[PDB]
């Protein structure tokens, strides 16, 4: 065995991806265009709460049977979500697909959000949100999207405090009825035969066609949000509007990313192939970390660098990260650096799909924001087809555009966006 990747596209617009790799395990998923992006000052957090609500009673199965039933076959069930996409997947051995599927279908299409079940659940948002925020990494990112925007994307990923307990069965229902619509959903599925995954999506997936609520355009603000909290370590993130998903300029940035440096490849090692790192290294003497930050969203994106450092040295460290961006925007890029990166990127991409998880994610992502599957050789052809200029230009666009900065720690010696 070893072949294909079919992908039907039902009447109502419901896309169905599929691929049989004969893995002793399946992993079906329901991808959807939904998230804190469609939230309005009136229903904030309803996205977050909807995420934790997956195990609540559904018209077909009960809170009890869902969890018991899935565990009965050594199954699993999770909900991963960005500011603009929500994925509901379940894993299990090949012979239990049909069983685990019931709850999957039920959860995503037929929730009941019973008032009480919902009231008892909300206090959880306080907890769930508390473990996440244990990593400062997650704090500045929230506040970034808040300074980088005025709406949609500016909406936080974790239910804001004041709204805990104030969400309602209505809000959840409406949110679901207005977004979990066949033309915004995709039913991907590794480890299964296409006809089977298709038949399922048909006779069952009820909540039909529509495009419902449409997200407001992503306006750009370019604000600066600072958080003085005492931490000995200051986290900083300075960015500019970059490329958006499916943008021609995207592949350019992704490359300028690896060029500047984004993530180590050697344990406890130094990164020479990382200009940004190497630059900051020469700047400070004490421990730190700096990387190329790059996010690609449907109608917008963010690009820049992120730096962790001792409070008293965030000044010299952030500057350094800047100069190394200006220096790169002024042709400070070898034709080889462009070659190296391109490799690191193709490798990174190719490794990122060995995981049952990483694969399904990749496949589904396309099948939703496209309806097709760009062959691995095509994505490779698109990547190296990036001039040494596209890169320097990307860099420019950054040194020119209006920057938005997010920083948190003992900011006493940290610079303001206008001092860079």
């Amino acid at each position: 065995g070893a072949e294909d990747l079919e992908i039907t596209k039902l009447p109502n617009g419901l896309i169905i991806a599929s691929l049989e790799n004969f893995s002793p395990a399946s992993r079906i998923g329901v991808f959807i265009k939904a998230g804190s992006r469609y939230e309005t000052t009136a229903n904030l957090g309803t996205a977050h709460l909807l995420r934790l609500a997956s195990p609540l009673t559904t018209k077909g199965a009960s809170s009890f049977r869902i969890t018991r039933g899935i565990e009965a076959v050594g199954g699993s069930l999770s909900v991963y979500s960005t500011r603009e996409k929500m994925t509901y997947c379940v894993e299990c051995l090949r012979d239990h697909v049909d069983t685990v599927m019931e709850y999957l279908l039920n959860v995503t299409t037929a929730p009941e959000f019973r008032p009480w079940e919902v009231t008892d659940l909300q206090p959880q948002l306080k907890v769930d949100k508390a473990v996440a925020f244990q990593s400062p990494q997650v704090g500045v990112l929230e506040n970034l999207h808040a300074a980088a925007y005025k709406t949609a994307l500016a909406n936080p990923l974790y239910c804001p405090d004041y709204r805990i307990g104030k969400i309602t069965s209505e809000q959840l229902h409406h949110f679901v009825q207005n977004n979990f619509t066949s033309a915004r959903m995709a039913l991907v599925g590794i480890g299964v035969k296409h006809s089977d995954l298709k038949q399922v999506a048909e006779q069952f997936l009820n909540i039909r066609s529509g495009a419902g609520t449409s997200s407001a355009k992503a306006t750009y603000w370019g604000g600066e949000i600072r958080e003085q909290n005492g931490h000995s370590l200051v986290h900083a993130a300075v960015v500019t509007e970059g490329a958006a998903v499916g943008s021609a300029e995207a592949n350019a940035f992704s490359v300028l990313q690896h060029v500047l440096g984004a993530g180590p490849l050697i344990k406890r090692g130094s990164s020479v192939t990382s200009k940004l790192y190497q630059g900051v290294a020469k700047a400070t003497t004490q421990p730190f970390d700096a990387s190329a930050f790059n996010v690609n969203y449907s109608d917008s994106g963010l690009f820049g660098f992120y730096t962790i450092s001792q409070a008293a040295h965030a000044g010299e460290v952030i500057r350094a990260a800047m100069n190394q961006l200006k220096a790169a925007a002024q042709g400070g890029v070898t034709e080889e650096d462009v070659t190296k990166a391109k490799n690191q990127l193709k490798a990174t991409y190719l490794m990122s799909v060995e995981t049952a998880q990483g694969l399904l994610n990749e496949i589904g992502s396309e099948a939703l924001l496209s309806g097709t599957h760009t062959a691995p050789s095509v994505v490779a052809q698109k990547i190296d087809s990036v001039t040494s200029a596209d890169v320097v230009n990307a860099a420019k666009k950054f040194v020119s555009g209006k920057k938005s900065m997010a920083a948190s720690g003992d900011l006493g010696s940290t610079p303001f966006l206008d001092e860079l």
Binding site: S62, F64, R68, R114, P115
Partner: protein, 101 residues
Amino acid sequence: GRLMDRIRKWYYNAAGFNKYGLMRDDTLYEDDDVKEALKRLPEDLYNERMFRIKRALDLSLKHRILPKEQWVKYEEDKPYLEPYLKEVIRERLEREAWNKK
């Protein structure tokens, strides 16, 4: 049929909780199911049951009842909890049955 559909109306008046202004569901002995059921009642139905009950208790200590005008009428009695209580028991029976399996 509409035979005991009379007997019921008879017994309903025979009992006489309605002389206290209590709904049939107000007089239920609060065991475990009934207790869970009551937690699901909406804020408003809950406070209403509460006043009705506290009202009845005050009448009992006083050794009085409500004037005939205020008595709940057989056909106007709200089975406000029966719906919830019925589900609570099904859920339970589901679990009970599933744990033997």
